Amino acid sequence: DIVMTQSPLSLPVTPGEPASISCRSRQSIVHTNRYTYLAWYLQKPGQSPQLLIYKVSNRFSGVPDRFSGSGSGTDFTLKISRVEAEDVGVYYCFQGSHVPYTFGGGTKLEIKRTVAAPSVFIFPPSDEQLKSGTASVVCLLNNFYPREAKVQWKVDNALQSGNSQESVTEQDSKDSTYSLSSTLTLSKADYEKHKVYACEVTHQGLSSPVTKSFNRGE
Amino acid sequence: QVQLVQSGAEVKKPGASVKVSCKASGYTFTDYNMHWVRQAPGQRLEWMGDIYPYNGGTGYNQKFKGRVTITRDTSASTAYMELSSLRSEDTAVYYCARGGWHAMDSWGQGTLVTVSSASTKGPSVFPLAPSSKSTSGGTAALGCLVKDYFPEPVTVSWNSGALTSGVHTFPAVLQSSGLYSLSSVVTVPSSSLGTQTYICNVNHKPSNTKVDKKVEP
Amino acid sequence: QLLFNKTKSVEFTFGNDTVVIPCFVTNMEAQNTTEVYVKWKFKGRDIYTFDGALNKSTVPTDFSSAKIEVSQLLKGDASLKMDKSDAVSHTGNYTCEVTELTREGETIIELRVV
Ligand SMILES: *[C@@H]1O[C@H](CO)[C@@H](O)[C@H](O)[C@H]1NC(C)=O
Ligand SMILES: *[C@@H]1O[C@H](CO)[C@@H](O)[C@H](O)[C@H]1NC(C)=O
């Protein structure tokens, strides 16, 4: 197996700026035929891989002129004129000379946007699940940037730990944004003991703490 | 339209075997070469083999020596891939990949097979109803939450594919008892919450459960 | 993974003011010349290459007469046409290597005294 190394593993770039990804191989990938088949792929967030560059520098049908590949034998480099919000994802180099064919580690591309304020929502538990003996309360922050966001839970002005879980999406291929939904889980008995359930959120885009709340049975 | 459709996700116990389909449409099956690619955490993607549907010739990755068999059927334009004696190393998304001798140019959905000895459990789904507390400046948020299911994946669509703008389906988190949990949310106008209806479709194929839930304010 | 209508050998004479080395592809799916890349060789290196992405014909000094017709490159025909000048000079095993995007096949054909 021919190892292939890429660098970096993550590349912060603001759209409109170049971005170069290199992928080197221990031993050359030149075939007897005197061709070297190195193919560049990208796995879009949520979508199966797609081809951009085949044979070092020949682009695929439908790829913009802005994706160009170069390199010889040992060293190779994938360059783009400018990145756009549509280019988010992780990129792979792939060798097509010696069996077995191998892939690279993967250089993940991230888009640098301006500051975006979260929109905060909270969801009381469904009546069909309080009939099951459980009560989960969902706080969600939606399309904020950057991803660094703090979510604190308060039940009767008391702060909670040990009963929370968090979940953040991928970056969006159009508006370069993330969102996160925090799941707080209770038993039905311990839920019918308190009144106010609050969701405290702090993030750089907020002027000040945002607190979303509801009272049980309202 | 060049399109490759494979089978659904599977569950197997270690020591068993799995056979993943890949039906091809939009092109002539034997005109291209077809590859098989898998992404297993936390390793690189691994080319496992190829098959040329005209002659039936094959070439494999000897990493899988003695346990992979790539087969062919031109009567149905479907290529197959069998992986025997499974372990926790093989649980991954298997990609059927069409292309030439040394590159793939179009790929399929992906097949996630989970090798485990735990029992498969059907999801339970609950409305996340929109409320006075979930409205912000004329915009309203609603969704469903899919809880206590194993293994992965769960697929969540809204209004059977007619609503995709503003959909945010989160990655599943794992609970202490070993089951997964993910929440699907979408943003809609709050003016029209009484005239329109939003139905989540949640499908978890390993256990063959298809439940559809309409959420009301 | 490209297929051809094979032709083992072709014969020329001195009456032949020009010569053709047939090469036909039965399953090429390219709709434009940007996607096609042809490479002809004879006992070694590339007598003729046509880079469809740049539409640049390249010919050695000793094969300045060799050419293909691009107006039927999409129809599957990429047959070299030269003259007896560089045909009598060069007789032997010629190879037709055609590439359309990621796929690629090849074939070879053989190139009468009084
Ligand atoms: C087969 O090759 C011959 C060679 O001249 C050509 O005339 C014919 O058109 C080819 N077959 C098809 C179906 O094109
Ligand atoms: C070249 O010679 C071949 C072999 O006889 C013949 O079929 C062909 O017609 C000749 N070409 C021309 C232009 O006469």
Residue numbers in the entry:
A (entry chain B): 1 to 218
B (entry chain A): 1 to 217
C (entry chain D): 1 to 111, 114 to 116
From the paper:
These mAbs showed potent SIRPα-blocking activity, good binding affinity to both human and cyno CD47 (1–4 nM), and did not induce hemagglutination or platelet aggregation. The detailed atomic interactions of C47B161, C47B222 and B6H12.2 with the human CD47 extracellular domain were determined using crystal structures of Fab/CD47 complexes. The C47B157 complex structure was not determined because C47B157 and C47B161 have identical CDRs and are expected to bind to the same epitope. Specifically, the CD47 regions of overlap for each antibody are: C47B161: residues Q1, N27, E29, E97, and L101-E104; C47B222: residues E35, Y37, K39, D46, T49, T99, L101 and T102; B6H12.2: residues E29, Q31, T34, E35, Y37, K39, D46, E97 and T99-E104. To characterize the role of Fc function on the activity of anti-CD47 antibodies, three lead mAbs, IgG2σ C47B157, C47B161 and C47B222, were converted to an effector function competent human IgG1 Fc format and were evaluated in vitro and subsequently in vivo. In contrast, effector function silent IgG2σ C47B157, C47B161, C47B222 and B6H12.2 had a minimal effect on phagocytosis.
CD47, also known as integrin-associated protein, is a ubiquitously expressed 50 kDa cell surface transmembrane Ig superfamily member. Therefore, therapeutic targeting of CD47 may have widespread application in numerous cancers, as overexpression of CD47 may allow cancer cells to co-opt CD47-SIRPα signaling and evade phagocytosis-mediated elimination.
